[PDB]
Each structure stands twice: as structure tokens, then as C-alpha cells.
């Protein structure tokens, strides 16, 4: 496969600070997602889609009469257990993604898998979840005092 609608997204490169005319009031809680939020099938940003998007193609008849149609991924809203968070997390879930999760053994595992492909096929929400989980894990491992 290819992650063409993820790895093609580009975000305004930040100027690092050794002030700007408009600085935000709050503090960036989460680390910046490499690929940013998708401006294409924004339904996907709410949950875990595995880099699957709406396709647009042609309905074709017996007379070869083309007529535009769309294809949706099989999204299902699904509350799934996270050992690290110690609670079930409900999200939108392409059934493929669900299957993958099942295979890999847990949502935490899915989130915290290293490969770039996995990173790509998380959403911004997915990224956030991953951050939460890994941070939690770190905390568990390493209390402030050894």
C-alpha cells in the first residue's frame, strides 16, 4: 500500500525560539504530529481509520454508462480495553483496524508499534492516544525517585 494522502500533507515549519505577533494562550499538551490533521476526509480525524479514506469512482452499467459514486470504509464505533490507561476507549474504527488490533493484542500495542507505516495510519486522535499511553507507561516504569 501507499500512504499518499498522509505523507503528502505539509504543515508550516515552526521557527525555533532562542516574539511572534500572535502567540496562543494555552500550552501545547501533545507533541506535534508529523503529518498534521487531514483536511480531506475530516470524518477520519475523530478515530482510527488505518489510513483508509473515501474513494471516489464510477458506477458502471451494462451499457458502460459511467456515473460517479463514492466508497466508504466500514467504520464502527467501538469501546476497547487499554491495559495501560485502565479503561475502555471508545472510538470510530475501520473494521480492518479492529482486526489488526485483535491480531496485535490490544489497543496500546497497536498505538505503540514503532514502524513509520503505523505512525502514518494513526490519526491525530490516534497520535494523542499513543502519547497518552506511552507517557503513562513511562510513569509506571519510572517514579520521580528511583
Amino acid at each position: 500500500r501507499q500512504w499518499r494522502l498522509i505523507e503528502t500533507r505539509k504543515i508550516a515549519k515552526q521557527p525555533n525560539y532562542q516574539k511572534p505577533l500572535h502567540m496562543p494562550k494555552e500550552r501545547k499538551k501533545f507533541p506535534d504530529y508529523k503529518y498534521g490533521e487531514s483536511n480531506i476526509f475530516k470524518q477520519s480525524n475523530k478515530g482510527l481509520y488505518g489510513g483508509s479514506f473515501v474513494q471516489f469512482g464510477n458506477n458502471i452499467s451494462e451499457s458502460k454508462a459511467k456515473t460517479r459514486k463514492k466508497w466508504l470504509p466500514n467504520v464502527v464505533k467501538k469501546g476497547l480495553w487499554s491495559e495501560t490507561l485502565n479503561r475502555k476507549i471508545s472510538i470510530k474504527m475501520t473494521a480492518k483496524v479492529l482486526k489488526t488490533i485483535s491480531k496485535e493484542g490490544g489497543i496500546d500495542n497497536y498505538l505503540t508499534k514503532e514502524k513509520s507505516a503505523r505512525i502514518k495510519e494513526l490519526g491525530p486522535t490516534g497520535w494523542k492516544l499513543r502519547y497518552r499511553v506511552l507517557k503513562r507507561k513511562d510513569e509506571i516504569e519510572n517514579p520521580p525517585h528511583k
Binding site: 505503540t112 514503532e114 507517557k135 513511562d138
Partner: protein, 49 residues
Amino acid sequence: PEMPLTEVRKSHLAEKKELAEREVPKLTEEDMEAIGARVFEFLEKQKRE
């Protein structure tokens, strides 16, 4: 705040560090000389041919 490293990532980093610790096979001057000599010989052979 930067995302914390994953276990696998950490391991990889460690491995990299270990690799770095060892001496890099730097090019030997003697070796270079030898190579040059070989090249010269080859050239001579070609000329002869």
C-alpha cells in the same frame, strides 16, 4: 513536549551507541599505496597488450 521513546526505539538507540563505541575501520595509507601499485600494474599490462 516531545513524545517519549518506545522500548524498541530505546533498544535501537542503545545498539547504535554500542556500534559507535568501537573503532571505525579507517582507510590505511599502506592499503592505499598497495591499491595504487595494483592500478599501475594493470595499466602497464594494458599497455603491453
